[PDB]
């Protein structure tokens, strides 16, 4: 089911990040857009835009150690179909993210998956959410 694809995708995405950041970029389309935690820079963090699989790999690889330390509590998943022939999948996740020894950050993250049996990430945006109070 589509719910199964989404859950599997999310689990695999974050887990591959723990195991090898230098291979993460291959789950992205060649022309993918990434907006991710700016490791090169409060209950929010700045993000940075990165375009294309080569630059996405340079990003994850330069930040390997930090990327490997990423952990989360995944609270919610929403999905819809989108794109050409309604065959792509739009996914929104929310939860609380942290890295080894850091406080938690509330986040929302959106992906779009384009069919390659498999899918390539064409879009990946994270946004941190500050407390109401």
């Amino acid at each position: 089911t589509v719910q199964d694809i989404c859950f599997a995708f999310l689990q695999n995405y974050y887990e591959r990040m723990r195991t090898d950041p230098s291979k993460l970029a291959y789950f992205y389309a060649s022309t993918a857009e990434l907006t991710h935690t700016n490791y090169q820079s409060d209950d929010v963090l700045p993000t940075v835009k990165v375009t294309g699989r080569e630059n996405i790999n340079k990003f994850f690889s330069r930040n390997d150690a930090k990327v490997r330390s990423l952990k989360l509590k995944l609270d919610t998943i929403d999905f819809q179909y989108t794109g050409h022939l309604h065959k792509s999948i739009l996914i929104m996740a929310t939860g609380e993210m942290f890295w080894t020894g850091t406080p938690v950050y509330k986040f929302c993250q959106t992906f779009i998956l384009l069919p390659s049996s498999t899918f390539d990430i064409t879009n990946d945006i994270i946004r941190f959410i500050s407390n109401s109070f």
Binding site: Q11, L74, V104
Partner: peptide, 25 residues
Amino acid sequence: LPLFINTTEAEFAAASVQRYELNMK
């Protein structure tokens, strides 16, 4: 679900307490 990914829950609870202590500082 919630689902803990790359972490345990106790580890999450500790990170959450960290945020709470920062909020009240």
